[PDB]
Coordinates of C-alpha atoms in Angstrom, one line a residue:
Chain A
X1 CA -83.8 -0.7 -109.0
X2 CA -85.8 1.0 -106.2
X3 CA -83.2 0.6 -103.3
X4 CA -80.0 0.7 -105.5
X5 CA -78.8 4.0 -104.1
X6 CA -80.5 4.0 -100.7
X7 CA -78.8 4.6 -97.3
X8 CA -79.6 2.5 -94.3
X9 CA -81.5 5.3 -92.7
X10 CA -83.7 5.6 -95.8
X11 CA -84.3 1.9 -95.8
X12 CA -85.5 2.1 -92.1
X13 CA -87.6 5.1 -93.2
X14 CA -89.3 3.0 -95.9
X15 CA -89.9 -0.1 -93.8
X16 CA -91.3 2.1 -91.0
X17 CA -94.0 3.8 -93.2
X18 CA -94.6 0.6 -95.2
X19 CA -95.2 -1.8 -92.3
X20 CA -95.5 -0.3 -88.8
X21 CA -96.3 3.4 -89.0
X22 CA -99.7 3.4 -90.8
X23 CA -101.5 0.7 -88.9
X24 CA -104.8 1.6 -87.2
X25 CA -104.9 2.8 -83.6
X26 CA -105.7 -0.5 -82.1
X27 CA -103.1 -2.5 -84.1
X28 CA -100.2 -0.3 -83.1
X29 CA -101.0 -0.8 -79.4
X30 CA -100.9 -4.6 -79.9
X31 CA -97.6 -6.3 -79.2
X32 CA -98.5 -9.2 -81.4
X33 CA -99.5 -7.1 -84.4
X34 CA -96.5 -4.8 -84.0
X35 CA -94.1 -7.7 -83.8
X36 CA -95.8 -9.4 -86.8
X37 CA -95.1 -6.3 -89.0
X38 CA -91.5 -6.1 -87.8
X39 CA -90.9 -9.7 -88.8
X40 CA -92.4 -8.9 -92.2
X41 CA -90.2 -5.8 -92.4
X42 CA -87.2 -7.9 -91.6
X43 CA -88.0 -10.5 -94.3
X44 CA -88.7 -7.6 -96.7
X45 CA -85.3 -6.2 -95.9
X46 CA -83.4 -9.4 -96.2
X47 CA -85.1 -10.9 -99.3
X48 CA -85.7 -7.8 -101.4
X49 CA -83.9 -4.7 -100.2
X50 CA -80.5 -6.3 -99.7
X51 CA -80.6 -7.8 -103.2
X52 CA -80.8 -4.4 -104.7
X53 CA -78.0 -2.9 -102.6
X54 CA -75.1 -5.1 -101.4
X55 CA -73.9 -2.3 -99.2
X56 CA -76.7 -3.0 -96.7
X57 CA -75.7 -5.5 -94.0
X58 CA -77.5 -8.7 -93.3
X59 CA -79.1 -8.6 -89.8
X60 CA -80.9 -10.9 -87.5
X61 CA -84.5 -10.5 -86.4
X62 CA -83.6 -9.3 -82.9
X63 CA -80.9 -7.0 -84.2
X64 CA -83.1 -5.5 -87.0
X65 CA -85.9 -4.9 -84.5
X66 CA -83.5 -2.9 -82.2
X67 CA -82.2 -0.6 -84.9
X68 CA -85.7 0.0 -86.2
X69 CA -87.1 1.1 -82.8
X70 CA -84.3 3.6 -82.1
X71 CA -84.7 4.9 -85.7
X72 CA -88.3 6.0 -85.2
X73 CA -89.1 8.2 -82.2
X74 CA -92.8 7.4 -82.5
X75 CA -91.9 4.0 -81.0
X76 CA -89.7 5.5 -78.2
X77 CA -92.8 6.1 -76.1
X78 CA -94.0 2.6 -76.8
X79 CA -90.7 0.7 -76.4
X80 CA -90.0 2.4 -73.1
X81 CA -93.0 1.0 -71.3
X82 CA -93.5 -2.2 -73.4
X83 CA -89.8 -3.2 -73.5
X84 CA -90.0 -6.4 -71.4
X85 CA -93.3 -7.5 -72.9
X86 CA -92.0 -7.2 -76.5
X87 CA -88.6 -8.8 -75.9
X88 CA -90.2 -11.8 -74.2
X89 CA -92.7 -12.1 -77.1
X90 CA -90.0 -11.7 -79.8
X91 CA -88.0 -14.5 -78.3
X92 CA -90.7 -16.9 -77.1
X93 CA -93.3 -16.5 -79.9
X94 CA -94.6 -19.7 -81.3
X95 CA -93.3 -19.8 -84.8
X96 CA -93.9 -22.4 -87.6
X97 CA -90.9 -24.8 -87.8
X98 CA -90.0 -25.3 -91.5
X99 CA -87.2 -27.7 -92.5
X100 CA -85.5 -28.0 -95.9
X101 CA -82.3 -28.8 -97.7
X102 CA -79.6 -26.9 -99.7
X103 CA -78.5 -29.7 -102.1
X104 CA -75.1 -28.7 -103.6
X105 CA -73.1 -30.5 -106.3
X106 CA -69.7 -32.1 -105.9
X107 CA -67.9 -28.8 -106.7
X108 CA -70.2 -26.9 -104.3
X109 CA -71.0 -24.1 -106.8
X110 CA -74.5 -25.2 -108.0
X111 CA -77.6 -25.8 -105.9
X112 CA -81.0 -27.3 -106.5
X113 CA -83.8 -24.7 -106.6
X114 CA -87.6 -25.4 -107.0
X115 CA -90.3 -23.2 -108.5
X116 CA -94.1 -23.2 -108.1
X117 CA -96.9 -22.8 -110.7
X118 CA -98.0 -19.3 -109.8
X119 CA -96.8 -16.5 -112.1
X120 CA -95.2 -14.6 -109.1
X121 CA -93.9 -17.8 -107.4
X122 CA -90.1 -17.4 -107.2
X123 CA -87.3 -19.9 -106.9
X124 CA -86.6 -21.3 -103.4
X125 CA -85.0 -24.1 -101.5
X126 CA -87.2 -27.2 -101.1
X127 CA -88.7 -26.7 -97.6
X128 CA -92.0 -27.1 -95.9
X129 CA -93.8 -27.1 -92.5
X130 CA -93.2 -29.9 -90.0
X131 CA -95.9 -32.4 -89.0
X132 CA -96.9 -33.5 -85.5
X133 CA -94.4 -35.7 -83.7
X134 CA -92.0 -35.4 -86.7
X135 CA -88.3 -35.0 -86.4
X136 CA -86.3 -32.2 -87.8
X137 CA -84.3 -34.5 -90.1
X138 CA -87.4 -36.5 -91.0
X139 CA -89.3 -33.3 -92.1
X140 CA -86.4 -32.2 -94.3
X141 CA -86.2 -35.7 -96.0
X142 CA -90.0 -35.7 -96.6
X143 CA -90.1 -32.2 -98.1
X144 CA -87.2 -32.9 -100.4
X145 CA -88.7 -36.2 -101.5
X146 CA -92.1 -34.7 -102.1
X147 CA -90.9 -31.5 -104.0
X148 CA -87.9 -33.0 -105.9
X149 CA -88.3 -36.8 -105.8
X150 CA -84.8 -37.3 -104.5
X151 CA -84.3 -39.3 -101.3
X152 CA -81.6 -37.7 -99.2
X153 CA -82.0 -40.1 -96.3
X154 CA -78.5 -41.6 -96.7
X155 CA -76.8 -38.2 -97.2
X156 CA -78.4 -35.6 -94.8
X157 CA -76.3 -34.6 -91.8
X158 CA -78.1 -33.3 -88.7
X159 CA -75.2 -31.1 -87.8
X160 CA -74.6 -29.3 -91.2
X161 CA -77.4 -26.8 -91.6
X162 CA -78.3 -23.1 -91.6
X163 CA -80.9 -22.1 -89.0
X164 CA -82.6 -18.7 -89.1
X165 CA -85.9 -17.2 -88.0
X166 CA -87.4 -15.2 -90.8
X167 CA -91.0 -14.0 -91.5
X168 CA -92.3 -15.8 -88.4
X169 CA -90.8 -19.1 -89.3
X170 CA -88.0 -21.1 -87.6
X171 CA -86.3 -22.3 -90.8
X172 CA -83.5 -24.8 -90.8
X173 CA -82.0 -25.9 -94.2
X174 CA -79.7 -28.8 -94.0
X175 CA -76.7 -28.4 -96.3
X176 CA -76.2 -31.6 -98.4
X177 CA -73.2 -31.4 -100.8
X178 CA -72.1 -34.0 -103.4
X179 CA -75.4 -34.4 -105.2
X180 CA -74.9 -35.8 -108.7
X181 CA -75.8 -33.3 -111.5
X182 CA -77.3 -36.2 -113.5
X183 CA -80.0 -36.8 -110.9
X184 CA -83.4 -37.1 -112.5
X185 CA -85.7 -34.9 -110.3
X186 CA -89.4 -36.0 -110.7
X187 CA -91.8 -34.3 -108.3
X188 CA -94.6 -36.7 -109.0
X189 CA -95.5 -36.7 -105.3
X190 CA -96.5 -33.0 -105.2
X191 CA -98.1 -31.2 -108.2
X192 CA -97.7 -27.7 -106.6
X193 CA -94.2 -27.2 -108.1
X194 CA -93.3 -26.7 -111.8
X195 CA -89.6 -26.7 -112.4
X196 CA -86.5 -28.2 -110.7
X197 CA -83.2 -26.9 -112.1
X198 CA -79.6 -26.4 -110.9
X199 CA -78.7 -22.8 -110.3
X200 CA -75.1 -21.5 -110.2
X201 CA -74.5 -19.9 -106.9
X202 CA -72.6 -17.0 -108.5
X203 CA -75.8 -16.1 -110.4
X204 CA -77.7 -15.4 -107.2
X205 CA -77.7 -11.7 -106.1
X206 CA -75.8 -11.5 -102.8
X207 CA -73.4 -14.4 -103.4
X208 CA -70.9 -12.6 -105.7
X209 CA -70.4 -8.9 -104.8
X210 CA -67.9 -8.5 -107.6
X211 CA -70.4 -9.7 -110.3
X212 CA -73.0 -7.1 -111.5
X213 CA -76.2 -7.8 -109.7
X214 CA -78.9 -8.6 -112.3
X215 CA -82.0 -10.0 -110.8
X216 CA -84.0 -11.3 -113.8
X217 CA -85.5 -14.3 -111.9
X218 CA -87.4 -14.1 -108.7
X219 CA -86.1 -15.7 -105.5
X220 CA -88.0 -16.4 -102.3
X221 CA -86.1 -17.0 -99.0
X222 CA -82.8 -17.6 -100.9
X223 CA -80.8 -14.4 -100.4
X224 CA -80.6 -14.5 -96.5
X225 CA -79.1 -18.0 -96.7
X226 CA -76.4 -17.1 -99.1
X227 CA -74.2 -15.3 -96.5
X228 CA -74.0 -18.4 -94.2
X229 CA -73.8 -20.8 -97.2
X230 CA -70.9 -18.8 -98.7
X231 CA -69.1 -19.0 -95.3
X232 CA -70.0 -22.7 -95.0
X233 CA -68.5 -23.7 -98.4
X234 CA -65.4 -21.6 -97.7
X235 CA -64.8 -23.6 -94.5
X236 CA -65.4 -26.9 -96.2
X237 CA -63.0 -26.3 -99.1
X238 CA -60.3 -25.4 -96.5
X239 CA -61.2 -28.5 -94.4
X240 CA -61.0 -30.7 -97.5
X241 CA -57.5 -29.3 -98.3
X242 CA -55.8 -29.2 -95.0
Chain B
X1 CA -88.1 13.0 -77.1
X2 CA -90.8 15.7 -77.2
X3 CA -93.2 15.7 -80.1
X4 CA -95.9 18.4 -80.2
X5 CA -97.9 16.4 -82.8
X6 CA -97.2 12.8 -83.6
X7 CA -99.6 12.7 -86.6
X8 CA -97.9 15.6 -88.4
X9 CA -94.6 13.8 -87.8
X10 CA -96.0 10.6 -89.0
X11 CA -97.2 12.2 -92.2
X12 CA -93.8 14.0 -92.5
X13 CA -91.9 10.7 -92.9
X14 CA -94.7 9.3 -95.0
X15 CA -94.2 12.0 -97.6
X16 CA -90.4 11.6 -97.2
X17 CA -90.7 7.9 -98.3
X18 CA -93.0 8.7 -101.2
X19 CA -90.6 11.4 -102.5
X20 CA -87.8 8.9 -102.2
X21 CA -89.5 6.6 -104.6
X22 CA -91.3 9.2 -106.8
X23 CA -89.8 12.7 -106.6
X24 CA -92.7 14.2 -108.6
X25 CA -94.9 13.7 -105.6
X26 CA -95.7 17.1 -104.0
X27 CA -98.1 16.3 -101.1
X28 CA -100.2 13.6 -99.5
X29 CA -104.0 14.1 -99.7
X30 CA -105.2 11.2 -97.5
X31 CA -104.1 7.9 -96.1
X32 CA -105.9 4.5 -95.8
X33 CA -104.6 1.9 -93.3
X34 CA -104.9 -1.4 -95.3
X35 CA -105.8 -1.8 -99.0
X36 CA -105.8 -4.9 -101.2
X37 CA -105.6 -4.6 -105.0
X38 CA -107.8 -6.6 -107.3
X39 CA -107.4 -6.7 -111.1
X40 CA -110.2 -7.4 -113.6
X41 CA -108.9 -9.8 -116.3
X42 CA -108.8 -8.4 -119.8
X43 CA -110.5 -11.5 -121.1
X44 CA -113.6 -10.4 -119.2
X45 CA -113.8 -13.5 -117.1
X46 CA -113.6 -13.0 -113.3
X47 CA -112.2 -10.8 -110.6
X48 CA -108.6 -11.8 -110.1
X49 CA -106.8 -10.8 -106.9
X50 CA -103.4 -9.2 -107.4
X51 CA -100.5 -9.9 -105.0
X52 CA -100.3 -6.1 -104.3
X53 CA -101.4 -5.2 -100.7
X54 CA -100.3 -2.4 -98.4
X55 CA -100.9 1.2 -97.3
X56 CA -102.9 3.5 -99.5
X57 CA -101.5 7.0 -100.1
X58 CA -103.7 9.5 -101.9
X59 CA -101.1 11.7 -103.4
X60 CA -101.0 15.0 -105.5
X61 CA -98.5 15.5 -108.3
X62 CA -96.3 18.5 -108.9
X63 CA -98.6 19.2 -111.9
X64 CA -101.5 19.2 -109.4
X65 CA -102.5 15.7 -110.7
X66 CA -104.3 13.5 -108.2
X67 CA -103.1 9.9 -108.0
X68 CA -102.4 7.2 -105.4
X69 CA -99.4 5.1 -104.3
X70 CA -99.6 1.7 -102.5
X71 CA -96.5 0.6 -100.7
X72 CA -96.8 -3.2 -101.3
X73 CA -96.0 -5.3 -98.2
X74 CA -95.3 -8.4 -100.4
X75 CA -92.9 -7.0 -103.0
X76 CA -91.0 -3.8 -103.9
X77 CA -93.3 -3.5 -106.9
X78 CA -95.6 -0.8 -105.8
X79 CA -98.7 0.6 -107.4
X80 CA -98.6 4.2 -108.8
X81 CA -101.7 5.2 -110.9
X82 CA -103.1 8.6 -111.7
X83 CA -106.8 9.5 -111.9
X84 CA -107.1 11.6 -115.0
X85 CA -110.9 12.1 -114.8
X86 CA -113.4 11.4 -111.9
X87 CA -115.6 9.6 -114.4
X88 CA -113.1 6.7 -114.3
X89 CA -113.6 5.9 -110.6
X90 CA -116.7 4.2 -109.2
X91 CA -117.7 2.8 -105.8
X92 CA -119.3 -0.7 -105.8
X93 CA -119.9 -2.5 -102.5
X94 CA -116.5 -2.3 -100.6
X95 CA -114.5 -1.8 -103.8
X96 CA -113.1 1.3 -105.6
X97 CA -113.2 0.6 -109.3
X98 CA -110.8 2.6 -111.5
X99 CA -110.5 2.5 -115.3
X100 CA -107.0 3.8 -116.1
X101 CA -104.9 3.8 -119.3
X102 CA -107.5 3.2 -121.9
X103 CA -108.9 -0.3 -121.1
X104 CA -107.9 -1.5 -117.6
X105 CA -109.9 -2.2 -114.5
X106 CA -108.4 -2.2 -111.0
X107 CA -110.3 -2.7 -107.8
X108 CA -109.2 -1.4 -104.4
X109 CA -110.6 -3.3 -101.4
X110 CA -110.0 -1.2 -98.3
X111 CA -110.0 -2.8 -94.8
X112 CA -111.7 0.2 -93.1
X113 CA -115.0 0.9 -94.8
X114 CA -114.9 4.5 -93.7
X115 CA -111.7 5.1 -95.6
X116 CA -113.3 4.0 -98.9
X117 CA -116.1 6.6 -99.0
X118 CA -113.8 9.3 -97.7
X119 CA -111.2 8.7 -100.5
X120 CA -114.0 8.4 -103.1
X121 CA -115.5 11.8 -102.2
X122 CA -112.0 13.4 -102.4
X123 CA -111.3 11.8 -105.8
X124 CA -114.6 13.3 -107.2
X125 CA -113.0 16.7 -106.5
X126 CA -110.3 16.8 -109.2

């Protein structure tokens, strides 16, 4: 309800004062700290602000950073001398690799979401950090089996996924369609999640621009993946009927 | 790209954002860099930490009321509370206790210790 009628310049005004403008003197001069807040501002824009206003476009980390710098003249002095040092850091920063899975039903209109125990823990896709010497596919299989009890070893495809760097994490969620709706999900392996329920894709905020956006339930790192997932399912239904 | 004073310009867009969320805000009194919000449980048990954490804006209302806004870095749900009487705000260790709205206890942990006492002395003046 906050950013329902907010222009893109006002959104950049808010994220500027909220994240990067009011840091102490020594923190603003730090490339690491300034980049850290921009990544947080990007995640805050994708996960929260876009859900309240579908008119705002979905942007990548590097694209969002460029528009925010030109928006605020207070960073024009900084970005002019620290241009090469920031662009090299924004690309080559060591980020936490997180792997997961977007399990869809046979009709590809319902997905599996998981929720934690905390009161503010929102729904999200089953994902988690990678271990040492672990493969990308092996990490996604482990996190799904631990958080949902389902073994997607025989169904996961290393080429069907959505990769995105958000909030300082290299996230890759493997799209797995055709999951039976009668699957009994028992997360006995990990007691840090509470519920595992199928969610209609049309009920998520940004998936259905025609539907009235009502956000009664909380979602964490689900909205930014809806735009590629909507494009992914659109190409699969065409490829299935060609 | 000339700017005769970057701090005045920084506080100009600061008030611009606060008015965008709360039009009843008239001016900014003071700013604190980083502030975490703690909430005392009504069951009188322990000192629970709230998920609210961001920049602290000491703000003055159109009715000359003195409150504060906290732009949360973790959620769009901000914190907007008014200080009706200075007898509701105390300073214990590195916290800023505030008893608002009949029975409720919120604790503001500020990152810079100099900001806590400065805000506390301003609050004691209306």
